[PDB]
Write a protein that binds this ligand. Structure first.
Ligand code: NA
Ligand code: NA
Ligand code: NA
Lengths: 379, 383, 381
């Protein structure tokens, strides 16, 4: 059934992409082709002579703290409506899971067209974006800062912005590992980069932004300390004559709004991305917790191999082959969201999506690290 | 030297100032109702410019829940001045006065809704609670599995005494929730809204909600389930209005998990800073305040520029909260704003360190963060 | 289960009307609802415990199907409080309303649906459209002048002659309400103004009901008996040209007025409006005149009104009921019979739509006998 698409069928694949996501790309068409050859694994199902459905699996890595996890990005999932009754996407999604397990992808992330559809197959919401809007009046400067701000574009890409990013990302779970090639091909789009440097010319924070029709849209705001935060804010304030509206995309852990003269500004939390644990035993081999014991009875209706019972005790992870009626029963969706830090054991317990004794939940709540998830990227 | 406690004959004049300052006209019937309110449950302070009331402030005696513990709370409300008088900063005088009164009377904490955050920040208040407002459409109203209980409806004239305990058990989960007697429910909460209680299999109350429906839109102003069954219970009740509504709007705490359970959880969801709180007397406040003992000593050097009795150094060690007389350079330096918002649970010692509004060693602050309870602030009332 | 509500519960019923339909009735105007319900409504309900859970009003009516007046049961104000929706009490009430209508001799039933799909399940079908069109100032172009005159009237000046005008119009259609003087005053007038066109001889020829507010004339009924009246009424609308920026008119699908404009391409929508149901087929057919200008046998299904699961013999200018089984003939349900007999959807259409089965012979014959009268209702309840 499921075949790995070769170079010939790529135009056909993109014709389905163009149809499902209602856009028309002609010269930029060869970029897509290339991106696919160079960094995607494109999977399809044929009906007769025609490509009926596709899925892309992009090899990635993510940060869960300092630890890098091989992560399989699911993207461009699509089917022509006439073949929807066949349910080809299900077959493809199952196949990608098997491929991932086989290649050593412990974890998967995707951007849902609908959440309920991927929820069905084990993916779960795992990260938000905070979008906040301010106006001209909000642009009050903080105390003068000693360092300097400098501006760059795709062409002037400074290698040092990559370190800044890494330092930031390691504070979270689910941030994408950005190589130079990623930065240039995916991050800049139509944006302008600005880096704040401290008193002795050390890079300390960065932002990605654009200005059009009197609106500054700030896509990434990354300060490593308050000085950097202050330095960058002041830089923004220096645009006050040009801008009527400011829009910023940040993490929930970003405390900038609090410092404003009038902190009651428009601020929306949008669930953004979904994640999934692919190979549990292999995932927990890498995952560091916080240190009576914890037994997890994990269920997974789409990936057979995650139907396991796990023992988290004494700085160790072990698989209980023939378990007993004791410990926490949970879903792969629940496990995935919990281990990303998106929902807490207690929360999903209140919601009745995981089960256990009062004591047992308290123990679980205690081992999962408190680190919050975030992803600044798109695919 | 300027502030007087307004007597009954001036209450009417105060309301002409209220109406001017908050751009509304009281209905003639309500006027006497607003006077009674003020006579009974408000202490109204003003400053005169000759013959006329120039500025005013209401101190409302309240109590709040911080966990299971009830703190005497000074509700600051109706702070107003006429524009022709605004140059003289009468409001600053009134507010400084209310603080002196609150200390005299044994209030430990104070809360207000600000016309401007910046203004009250200067005199010691900080933000302490947010509201989360969310908007759904008809297509979001998908039933959850059926529960074996039932929902009943109520109005002001049918006020059921179980709602009071439903509220209380919810409030006790948070910091800053208002303590509500019958009078308060009847006079301040129902407004134009409808009450609906969920009852379990045994006809036992398990959760409530307050809402109204106008022009195809349900505004749910309070949603309070005690457990998941009552959450589904009330949710399915909302859903049973599917034919009636295009739009739905709920005001909840950032702790309400309902959103996560929706078919398409990416709905419009906005966190607005709502309310401000201030510790009035630290020493008295901390005597009532349960901390989280589980790993080194924590000293706090507290600065309060407008209440000098809070300019103290605090020792948090053993199980005691002691006070240190000797001037010592060791420990955390923070101000009363910082301390208030921390103890409300609104911002963490860690967050305020990163922002450099408090200061100490990594270790000192790690242990500060450790002792302050994980409880979340919330307030559902308005005054 | 179902009780006929007494005077004493009418206040409680209105609280359910205020809830389900989202409105607050006035202090004084509350009593006029109570009165109306006493006087001309049969208000039915089910109780859960001590509380009213669900309600249905049956309003005794009569309608025009051509010149023939049929007794009509108007279903109005159907509602349930949401915490009882699981109990399906509205179903119980609709079933009960059907039995009553049967026993009392109502042959047909009409209602305005909050949701069509709901009433279809129980046998009601769409049976009438409204046509709404909007014009602007530049559309109010005078026609040639006519010899007749127009007079304005209100609730208190109610002229008897409008009643005959309405009747003459009503008789051309199927589904129009029979309007007594009382209905006119208490339901038709509202806040509207009656204008009447009189001809050369000072004989009433047509009427309109309209209101003008914030530069919009809304015409809710436009009823010219002949073209002189059409023109006369239209000229009267045009004299308001310095007063209006927008003109809204509700008319029957068959009102040709728009064809006559300078620019007939104005905003114009057909809206499905009302629903009807044949309550008792056997008794309805005894009054229903057909077209005999060849054998027509109908197997009728009605999953909600049991007494309607019959096969009708219609032929030899006659009406009989075949107790004997035979598969030959037209199979249709009550929604299909109902919509066909009002003249809303032809047999030919419903065949193409696979909603009725049979041979070409029988269908073309069926299409032949059902008269070509178009349905319409200018009223609301
Ligand atoms: Na981005
Ligand atoms: Na409220
Ligand atoms: Na009408």
């Amino acid at each position: 059934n499921v075949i790995r698409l070769k170079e010939d069928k790529f135009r056909e694949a993109l014709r389905l992409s163009e149809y499902a996501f209602q856009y028309k790309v002609e010269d930029r068409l060869q970029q897509q082709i290339t991106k696919m050859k160079e960094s995607h694994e494109v999977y399809g199902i044929m009906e007769g002579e025609n490509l009926a459905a596709k899925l892309h699996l992009i090899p990635f890595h993510i940060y869960i703290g300092k630890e890098k996890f091989k992560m399989g990005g699911v993207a461009g999932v699509a089917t022509y409506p006439e073949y929807r009754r066949s349910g080809y996407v299900k077959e493809l999604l199952q196949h990608s899971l098997q491929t991932m397990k086989k290649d050593g992808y412990t974890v998967s992330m995707l951007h849902p067209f609908a959440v309920s559809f991927y929820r069905k197959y084990g993916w779960e919401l795992c990260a938000n974006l905070l979008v906040c809007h301010m106006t001209k009046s909000d642009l009050v400067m903080k105390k003068q800062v000693n360092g300097t701000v400098k501006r760059f574009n795709k062409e002037s890409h400074p290698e040092e912005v990559e370190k800044l990013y890494e330092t930031f990302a390691e504070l979270f779970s689910g941030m994408l590992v950005r190589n130079e090639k990623w930065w240039l091909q995916a991050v800049y789009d139509d944006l302008t980069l600005a880096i704040y440097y401290d008193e002795n010319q050390t890079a300390a924070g960065y932002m990605l932004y654009k200005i059009e029709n009197y609106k500054m849209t700030v896509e990434e705001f990354v300060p490593l300390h308050n000085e950097a935060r202050n330095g960058l804010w002041n830089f923004i304030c220096q645009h006050d004559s040009m801008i009527k509206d400011l829009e910023m995309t940040v993490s929930e852990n970003e405390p900038l709004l609090y410092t404003l003269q009038e902190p009651r500004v428009k601020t929306e939390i949008k669930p953004y991305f979904m994640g999934r644990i692919v190979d549990v035993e292999q995932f927990l081999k890498q995952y560091e917790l916080n240190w009576q014991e914890v037994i997890l009875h994990i269920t997974d209706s789409f990936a057979q191999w995650n139907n396991i019972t796990v023992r988290i005790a004494n700085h160790e992870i072990t698989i209980i082959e023939e378990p007993i009626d004791k410990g926490i029963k949970l879903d792969i969706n629940a496990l995935s969201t919990i281990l990303f830090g998106y929902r807490r054991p207690l929360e999903l317990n209140e919601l009745e999506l995981i089960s256990g004794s009062e004591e047992e939940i308290r123990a679980f709540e205690s081992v999962v690290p408190v680190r919050k998830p975030f992803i600044y990227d798109f695919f």
